[PDB]
RNA sequence: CUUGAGUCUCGUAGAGGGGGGUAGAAUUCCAGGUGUAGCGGUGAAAUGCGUAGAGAUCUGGAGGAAUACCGGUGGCGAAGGCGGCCCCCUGGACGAAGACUGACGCUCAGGUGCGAAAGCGUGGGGAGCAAACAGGAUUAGAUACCCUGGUAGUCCACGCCGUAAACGAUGUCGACUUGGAGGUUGUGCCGGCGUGGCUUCCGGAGCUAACGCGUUAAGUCGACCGCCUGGGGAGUACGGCCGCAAGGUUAAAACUCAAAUGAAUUGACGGGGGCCCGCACAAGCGGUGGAGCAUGUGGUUUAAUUCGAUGCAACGCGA
RNA sequence: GCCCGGAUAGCUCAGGGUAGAGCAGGGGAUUGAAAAUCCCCGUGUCCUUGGUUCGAUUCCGAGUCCGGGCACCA
RNA sequence: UGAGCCUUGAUGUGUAGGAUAGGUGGGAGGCUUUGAAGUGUGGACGCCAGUCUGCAUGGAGCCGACCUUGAAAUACCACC
């Protein structure tokens, strides 16, 4: 997240570039994950839950087109 | 007492409070201001407005050295990150760099236990 | 309500000035449906104020009005048990309504002989920043000023 | 005899295991420069740290534990489990063609070995975290949840312990029985076409009390082993064996009840989730609760103070 | 006894043409609570007395009380 | 680096008020081309009102009681 202002731009452009760099670097996520200790069991459980939910939503949207509402 | 004409702004933003300091390029401090020492205490100390006010007070407390060129380093997840930089620019300096320098363990130590609120 | 169906109610002008603002002032001051008494009191107080001020009935009243209008208020909002006091802008119609309400309320709490004299004194004080209405306006403004950190 | 079982040749992938070395980020502590009035924490506070100069920022040093991104319903192992990089020692699996031995096999009571975390013994180590403990709060109380500190322990060597929702709540081996969409790892032929090993989701017949399982079977069969016989009492008492201890393993009876239980169905409820409404809140205006009187009720009194209505939905009610 | 310092708001106390900061207490904003935040309200020979000065709490002198170091202590 | 002894520079704008004037003064004439009213210029302090300033252009004026102050004006001038 190193942002050097180039020649002749307004401030807001530089601020937005810095914000985009921070968002793409995943900084706040890493600092919020590492605030409290997570047991290994909880980590595995949440990973499996995320995978299951993603697959279920994918199947639902895949089959959603064929049914028509009105 | 001395003229430096350029310096580094260190912003330390946390979930409870925000601290702003100005240093030279070698790290020696020149002045500082904080959101808790600006009349805001309690739930009002951890808001972007308090960070902006603290940045204004820090800028006003360092007029003597005649700084015009400024660099920004931000660490921490607190609300007062963008507001402080906006207020710092509104104070009249010209910002050359912006950087996030928040620490990251590459494993590190073991965090405290989760709160059962 | 939950629906937002109503429109707006038409206000009739006052008899001998043709201004709906003074008609609303009369409406605010009126009690028990006795409108003639309210009109007599309002007219007498306006006459006395214009005589001691010299400008006129109307623009003296407007000048005394614009020294009581607020521009920001505070509303309570509970989130986690505690209540923040969020400041909010005041729409112009609400501004006039609050101004008239505060002027009438201030004139009600006084120790003069007649209600017309009470209103005249309070309104003249308002025209030059000494009435209790101006104090209330300033108190509201500074209370909103204190809670600027919660203005989202 | 070669078709089950095993050997030999070439290669492939992998956090499989034991031992040693080393790198970078971060936390804590020590020393020093700048600099000045707060920091820290919470729902809000306080205990706590700070003018004896903290917190913030810069430089140098010490020490311990764990390896961000890669990272993936990805991989390896009999299970427990295994994650930075490099070297040494080492186990298994799979594939392509070929030669070899010639039933050398499956299962297994007793027996032997391995076995998370906490715990025990002797000796080291100790950054961070954190049972017990102390203080601050919250509360009717709060031996708690929340905050500030904090010792065993968590780390290493050697030896005990032998238990977990040790779970796929599903013993091991072999055979047969329609499909679809993926992941990962080999090999053949000309991106296409085949052919092996492991693996995730859906589903057919069939099965099942249903839920569901469904070629990785809970379908159709064969071989061997372990275990069950209503709920409490009780995985407890006594005896034996094992252990330094904590305790583990084997394992009852009297007495008592008429049930205890599994899956699914309709409601109701939630300090579960969505979408709406009503003077239900919000915005306003005027009241009641205070005073005097009218009226009804309770209670008390009386010979009687007639009877009934008595949460909202009784109390200017039958009247 | 000698010396060294101080007495000011209800409390802590800062400061020759002056009396001040905060907290205690009253009410309203305010809600079911303390926060929280608002606003106002006094809280005055600056121990007393005399003396200089165009006026002294800011200068000097002395008496009431209190602290510290010493003296007397036969 | 702390203290003392010197010497100098300024500094010290209640209230009136041209006046960032402390009690006290020999005493209203010095200064000026031994480059001056006022200009450009650079500097220190400053309750920022008003001093002071290295140099020059520039050229030679300010100027003392005089009335608001209790006081008079670094007009030459002592002491703190
Ligand atoms: Mg914590
Ligand atoms: Mg409505
Ligand atoms: Mg490997
Ligand atoms: Mg390995
Ligand atoms: Mg230090
Ligand atoms: Mg495997
Ligand atoms: Mg190997
Ligand atoms: Mg043969
Ligand atoms: Mg056995
Ligand atoms: Mg252990
Ligand atoms: Mg132990
Ligand atoms: Mg031990
Ligand atoms: Mg030990
Ligand atoms: Mg406690
Ligand atoms: Mg701790
Ligand atoms: Mg222990
Ligand atoms: Mg068991
Ligand atoms: Mg079992
Ligand atoms: Mg098994
Ligand atoms: Mg089988
Ligand atoms: Mg299925
Ligand atoms: Mg069955
Ligand atoms: Mg039985
Ligand atoms: Mg037993
Ligand atoms: Mg026994
Ligand atoms: Mg023991
Ligand atoms: Mg049942
Ligand atoms: Mg059931
Ligand atoms: Mg429901
Ligand atoms: Mg519901
Ligand atoms: Mg209402
Ligand atoms: Mg009444
Ligand atoms: Mg009755
Ligand atoms: Mg009845
Ligand atoms: Mg009625």
UniProtKB/Swiss-Prot annotation, chain C:
Keywords: Ribonucleoprotein, Ribosomal protein, RNA-binding, rRNA-binding, tRNA-binding. GO terms for cellular component: cytoplasm; cytosol; cytosolic small ribosomal subunit; membrane; ribosome. The keyword NADP does not apply. Signal peptide: none annotated. GO terms for biological process: cytoplasmic translation; negative regulation of translation; ribosomal small subunit assembly; translation. Transmembrane segments: none annotated. Changing residue 115 to G: Significantly decreases affinity for its own mRNA. One of its GO terms (molecular function) is tRNA binding. Part of the 30S ribosomal subunit. Contacts proteins S9 and S11. Cross-links to IF3 and the P and E site tRNAs. Belongs to the universal ribosomal protein uS7 family. The strain K12 sequence is shown. Has been predicted to contact the N-terminal domain of IF-3 based on footprint studies; exactly how IF-3 interacts with the 30S subunit is controversial. One of the primary rRNA binding proteins, it binds directly to 16S rRNA where it nucleates assembly of the head domain of the 30S subunit. Is located at the subunit interface close to the decoding center, where it has been shown to contact mRNA. Has been shown to contact tRNA in both the P and E sites; it probably blocks exit of the E site tRNA. This is Small ribosomal subunit protein uS7. The lineage of its organism: Bacteria, Pseudomonadati, Pseudomonadota, Gammaproteobacteria, Enterobacterales. The chain holds residues 2 to 153 of 179 of the full protein.
